[PDB]
Design a protein around this nucleic acid. Structure first.
Lengths: 102, 203, 210, 144
RNA sequence: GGCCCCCGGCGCGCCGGGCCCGGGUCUUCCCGGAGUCGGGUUGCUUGGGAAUGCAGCCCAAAGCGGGUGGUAAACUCCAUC
RNA sequence: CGCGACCUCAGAUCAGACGUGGCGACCCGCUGAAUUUAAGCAUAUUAGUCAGCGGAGGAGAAGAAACUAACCAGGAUUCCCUCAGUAACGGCGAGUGAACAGGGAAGAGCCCAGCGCCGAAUCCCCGCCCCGCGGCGGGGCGCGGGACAUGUGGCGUACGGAA
């Protein structure tokens, strides 16, 4: 009734004021940059694609995504990576068609 | 930065330069030694990234190793003992092929101390490693206080004892809840202190 | 081959366990050695404090000990920053630093660093030369005196509150404790499923508003 | 069959065109040994005369190393890039022509790393680049 | 406790080498480790149990990503390096 | 053809350096069984142990977190007390078996690559001139030779840094 301090579940403070802090600099590593993304996106077209990427691109051309995903999974391994990689295979196939009809 | 481009290139694959210049080694390790000096680190990316500087006193030896499992060496392959200690087909050695290569090159060239190694090709029954080596007695190295730790004799032949990044992995060494085999400093120390009795002066 | 009990024990490796320790006859000799080493180094660095750096007050991990404080590793970086001491200088003026320690209540500095500087000026950073031109400051408290000894470990454990005699108020008594605990405990465990079935009810409750 | 990014390395320049390129460069080569020392010593002596030190204008010169050349290409401060065609690991400069295509920086594939080496005191140099040149030679540059 | 020898000892006085380097506030620019992680599979090892560590072979990357959060799996927050 | 570079690759009683071999009490990396125990026996146990091999030091390996945690949070490594014969493994039989928290001994932090900027600003060797000289160095004259543009030195490394 009259509120008393008991913490339900997971808390990060039920009695102490959350004293402020700025994010550390080790958690920043990972995000791209205008230059590094440029390096990636030029070397990519300089080299090309792997056969497993090309096969999945053809299967997305015929547009059976529930088989393209299985192909990427059975080769790379984790559903997280397959889910995040089918997106990059699209949005590149899309660029291909969009710049051909152009 | 050029080395960024080189890095991204080596990260990517499915270009034939590997196929072209792997034979350039498979032939020559059979024309000349299976263990021979190279005159330049073929991957100035990876050599420098591991730690290398083309200052005088630095060598690389490119070396071949033969890959596979490890068949247990006994006469006629039928090992005496209780029948869980049979088995000679599928056995697997307990060190990285990279580490085997590192130690081979190190033991071949005394007076040169290992620093690390890296991969340059893998045909069907081989692996083509190369090893960076320091000449610990050249003044151009010993007069450089950043890297003279290799001089002192605590590192005499690091590679057989297994201190380098090639063979350290096999030590099962690491930090966390995924390495309690080694919480004393070594797979053998963390045993020898955990299976001792402990008799105080007062019990 | 028992008659009353059923308890089994470890010490049997058929190849001996004898080959491991019996020697603890060191113990007195080792005590002598370590004590003598402390005498030695405390003599060698004479004026500097015996136990060396200041340590910061921290609150321990898991539920079993989250009420008492103790000397942690070292002061942290943002708390030092708000104290206005450079990280590369704190150690030279004898302060412990471990950056890995994130801070979410800079309860340390308020006393610790100001009190430490107060004590350091009670007995001052000695100037780097007998003359003190801006390579040493406030030597006035060696011009006054010094400690021909040190201060041993700085205090850490003294805090409990005062608990006065206040008369009982009515609503406190009317409050019910066991019911509160049980029912508020069952709340959080039932929290998610209520949300699921609220969504379930809303699905038809709005398709019948379509 | 070599790949496209390797076969680009075989349509090298015409010999006489390369000769104009090199005769242009030989008025621009950087300072070699026994020249460095004499110029610097004379500059130390000009310090007491207030007419020259280490910090003072150097007319435009070559830029040799691959890291430097790629840096100034990706900053688009290059007006001409030369490339030795026979480099030991081709991956060193397989990407480079593509970079020049991306940023519109003129670039050429010459024969021999030895010539670029002779363009300094060193023995070899993977690439060289003119960023800017003396105006009087700007036109001669621009035609090539 | 005394004498006599050789090697230290930290300060001082002296010469000489080279070293001119810090701190705050504001704006802008930069920021990472590959046949490696990771997935599969076979052996070994571990208290680690729908697989703790290590290897061999097959596959093999992404960077708001990667790794971990002790039961395999998808969704979704959060913490942690 | 000839000349000259770079690259590869050779021999030399070339100039100067260096390694093997022993000991193994302790340390490190591999290999690694059987007696014995379960009243039999093969999974297990004996045991990652003796035997075998390689490699060092005055101590070695470890080491500044791809960590613990779940808290009002700790904060590299090692060692002792303790957690504890506990959580777990196991013809769930014999038996096997840790950690995290807590109190202690001791205490310390750091450096490249990379991205960048600075005239390759870097280093080695050889000739000689001055101090020293049983750990071969300090200055200097070398219009001496060489490595290094396929990256040396100064800055700087996630605790942000630089302008």
């Amino acid at each position: 009734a009259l509120r008393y301090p008991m913490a339900v579940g997971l808390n990060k403070g039920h009695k102490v004021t959350k004293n402020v802090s700025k994010p550390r600099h080790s958690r920043r590593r990972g995000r791209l940059t205008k230059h590094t993304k440029f390096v990636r996106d030029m070397i990519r077209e300089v080299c090309g694609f792997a056969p497993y990427e090309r096969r999945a691109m053809e299967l997305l051309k015929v547009s059976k995504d529930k088989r393209a995903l299985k192909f990427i999974k059975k080769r790379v391994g984790t559903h997280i990576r397959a889910k995040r990689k089918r997106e990059e295979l699209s949005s590149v196939l899309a660029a291909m068609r969009k710049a051909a009809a152009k | 930065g050029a080395y960024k481009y080189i890095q991204e290139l080596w990260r990517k694959k499915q270009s034939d330069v590997m196929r072209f210049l792997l034979r350039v080694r498979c032939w020559q390790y059979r024309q000349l030694s299976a263990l021979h000096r190279a005159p330049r680190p073929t991957r100035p990316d990876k050599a420098r990234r591991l730690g290398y500087k083309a200052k005088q006193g630095y060598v690389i030896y490119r070396i071949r190793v033969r890959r596979g499992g490890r068949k247990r060496p006994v006469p006629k392959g039928a090992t005496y003992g209780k029948p869980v200690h049979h088995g000679v087909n599928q056995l697997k050695f307990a060190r990285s092929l990279q580490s085997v290569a590192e130690e081979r090159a190190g033991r071949h060239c005394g007076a040169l101390r290992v620093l690390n190694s890296y991969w340059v090709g893998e045909d069907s029954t081989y692996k083509f490693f190369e090893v960076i080596l320091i000449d610990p007695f050249h003044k151009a190295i010993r007069r450089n206080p950043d890297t003279q730790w290799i001089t002192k004799p605590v590192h005499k032949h690091r590679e057989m004892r297994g201190l380098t990044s090639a063979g350290r992995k096999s030590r099962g060494l690491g930090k966390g809840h995924k390495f309690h085999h080694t919480i004393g400093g070594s797979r053998r120390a963390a045993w020898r202190r955990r299976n001792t009795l402990q008799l105080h002066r007062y019990r | 081959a028992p008659s009353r009990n059923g308890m089994i024990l470890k010490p049997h490796f058929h190849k001996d366990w004898q080959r491991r320790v019996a020697t603890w006859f060191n113990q007195p000799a080792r005590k002598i050695r370590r004590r003598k080493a402390r005498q030695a180094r405390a003599r060698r660095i004479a004026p500097r404090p015996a136990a060396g750096p200041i340590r910061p007050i921290v609150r321990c991990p898991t539920v079993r000990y989250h009420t008492k404080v103790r000397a942690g590793r070292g002061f942290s970086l943002e708390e030092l920053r708000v104290a206005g001491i450079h990280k590369k200088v704190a150690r030279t003026i004898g302060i412990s630093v471990d950056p890995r320690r994130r801070n979410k209540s800079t309860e340390s500095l308020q006393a610790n660093v100001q009190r430490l500087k107060e004590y350091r000026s009670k007995l001052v950073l000695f100037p780097r030369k007998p003359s003190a031109p801006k390579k040493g400051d406030s030597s006035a408290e060696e011009l006054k005196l010094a400690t021909q000894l040190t201060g041993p470990v700085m205090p850490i454990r003294n805090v409990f509150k005062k608990e006065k005699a206040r008369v009982i108020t009515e609503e406190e008594k009317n409050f019910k404790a066991f019911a509160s605990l049980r029912m508020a405990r069952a709340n959080a465990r039932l929290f998610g499923i209520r949300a699921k079935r609220a969504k379930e009810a809303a699905e038809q409750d709005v398709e019948k508003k379509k | 069959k070599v790949p496209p990014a390797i076969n680009q390395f075989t349509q090298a320049l015409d010999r006489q065109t390369a000769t104009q390129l090199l005769k242009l460069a030989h008025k621009y080569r950087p300072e070699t040994k026994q020249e460095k020392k004499q110029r610097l010593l004379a500059r130390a002596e000009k310090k007491a005369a207030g007419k020259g030190d280490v910090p003072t204008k150097r007319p435009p010169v070559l830029r040799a190393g691959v890291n430097t050349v790629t840096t100034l290409v990706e900053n688009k401060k290059a007006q001409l890039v030369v490339i030795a065609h026979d480099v030991d690991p081709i991956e060193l400069v397989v990407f480079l022509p593509a970079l020049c295509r991306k940023m519109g920086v003129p670039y050429c594939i010459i024969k021999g790393k030895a010539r670029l080496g002779r363009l300094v005191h060193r023995k070899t140099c993977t690439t060289v680049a003119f960023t800017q040149v003396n105006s009087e030679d700007k036109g001669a540059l621009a035609k090539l």
